[PDB]
Design a protein around this ligand. Sequence first.
Ligand SMILES: [Cl-]
Length: 764
Amino acid sequence: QTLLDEPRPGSLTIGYEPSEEAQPTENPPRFSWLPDIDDGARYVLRISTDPGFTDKKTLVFEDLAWNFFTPDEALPDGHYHWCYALWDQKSATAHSNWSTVRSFEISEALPKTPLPGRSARHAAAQTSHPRLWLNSEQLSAFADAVAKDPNHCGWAEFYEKSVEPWLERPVMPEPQPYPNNTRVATLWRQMYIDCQEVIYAIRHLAIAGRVLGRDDLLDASRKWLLAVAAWDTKGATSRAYNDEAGFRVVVALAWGYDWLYDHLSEDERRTVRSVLLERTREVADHVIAHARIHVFPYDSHAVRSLSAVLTPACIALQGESDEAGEWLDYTVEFLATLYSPWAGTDGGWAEGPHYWMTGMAYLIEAANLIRSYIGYDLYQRPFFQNTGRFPLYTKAPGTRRANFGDDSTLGDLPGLKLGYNVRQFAGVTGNGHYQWYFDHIKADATGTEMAFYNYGWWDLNFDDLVYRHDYPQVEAVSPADLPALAVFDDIGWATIQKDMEDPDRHLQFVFKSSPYGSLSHSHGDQNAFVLYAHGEDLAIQSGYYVAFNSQMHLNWRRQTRSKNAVLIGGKGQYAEKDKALARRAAGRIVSVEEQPGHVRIVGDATAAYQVANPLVQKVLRETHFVNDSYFVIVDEVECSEPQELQWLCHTLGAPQTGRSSFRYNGRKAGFYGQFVYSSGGTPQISAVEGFPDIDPKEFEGLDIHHHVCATVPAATRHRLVTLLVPYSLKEPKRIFSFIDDQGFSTDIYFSDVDDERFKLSLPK
Ligand SMILES: [Cl-]
């Protein structure tokens, strides 16, 4: 008997799930285990209520191709055990010892989301073409419906905006290598934009041809398709040379092959298929063998190619490639089982809302294609049921700098695709708040549709056509009744929204203390907050995108010093390049409490500071949202040796400072901050301009931002209480405070101008 190797998990691998440390969130559970030493191993999985795994009480899933699995049926409520072994295909038996036994509970509260097995999915997949978006029955019904009314699903708008332009256009010439195979940003981008247009032309002409019964459009589509099929698979548009170009060529070939299938001669089909298979194999070998996302599921670049590239290519190829059958199974099973380690059960996305936009964009495409083709609906999984609200609470219309993480749009209004993604989730859930969000994001942002960051990535007219055909339209509902508080526990984000519909009263507050640390597109921003109030960005996410790996990115935006957060002993949270340490440099939401007039959120960022400073023993931050009007921030820090405390807050313009306060006024709103209590000593307050130690060429011609720094003398214990009062410039506000520090606790009494009161009581 072979001895099964059961490797230790790492910071960037899958874990062994389900278990008592990781109870299932769905029924049936999503199973994963680290693979044996032999990468060409097959597995057998056993599930039983009997931890002895007696034959009659046990479910057995034999001959599994991969180290992850979702069963095709929900389990009865109860207590279960599971193990796995290596499986010998020929003799039909386990050829290794059984793994560690792990346990889990199934209750009725768990959403029931089974994955139809390989046989059922293969049987559900029709043999005819087309397959992508519409089957032949649907295509027929849609053609009849467009014959009776050219405005059916907005077809007339789609034809005009997304088909018509390609009728005049000469077939895109094959992209050329760079001067001396040395990549330049302009040429790299133009190249993948060129390949994106090849998707649009081939796909939209073919669709128009089939919908309108027009052979001439089919002929025009075919012309682009054969030209692209003739491009050098080892040339400039290969995955190896420019993967962005390579990805797009595969998608173009897939839509053309699928929708022109019957229009192409058998020989033309052979030409296209051969090149489609060859290019698809390049992508599949990268996702499966190199990126190895079934072991390393955080690789979003590889997950994107699985979703956006593999899905359409493999669907187009079904029945005419055994390889493609296997790659489609992997794709479907991966999205059903392992997608995604960035996703929280409450709908949060650990990388932040900008990366939610791009990530969801390509997940949505895969899910829509798969639902149509085999009738399996990924959106039924609870993450997708919940995730529409993440951008609703972190990227509300009008907010520019009021969230966290890498954001290529930082400083601008929320991107169009955020609304479009959320509309998809409106369709799924029937939620009218999601529709409202779509309407308002679109209104604020349209006119940027043809800009390279949208046009080079998705045709929104096609998104519309597909959405209107596939989903019932949801009526927008005012966010006036939207819950003020949304907690995303798994990722450690807490958000408050007030008066979202009102441009003069709208508040967006977000607090972050994440178990994900500074990993990947997250920063050293645990126990940090951002604040948009009275319709303006006040306490901001600072700096500019510039580029990944710029000084602005690495030395400002990743670092705690750019955040509305504390520094201890002159040091921030670990935010360098070591991925394991980045993940270790973590926070967590300790508690959230809510009653009328008082929201209390507690964050613990101890590990986050400890990684870079072993002197640190405890780092807690409380944020109080008081009487729907102002904030009280409580910073509690313990160290083994005297360390000073710095309290930072960032703004678009220069703050003015005082003896125990600072103030910033923007265009229509403003806020003041006051240090009402500091056990470690009276804070010294400074206003700082710009981005220290950052190359000014990186932000040339752009306005500098500012921050206030309040420094408390070195102490082993800090308790700092900061009152933050936002206001409309039309009605500036003042909050009064009294400290009662006698007793076993420090009591702070707050009152407004109408003697409305709040009492903070902090045990000593
Ligand atoms: Cl979450």
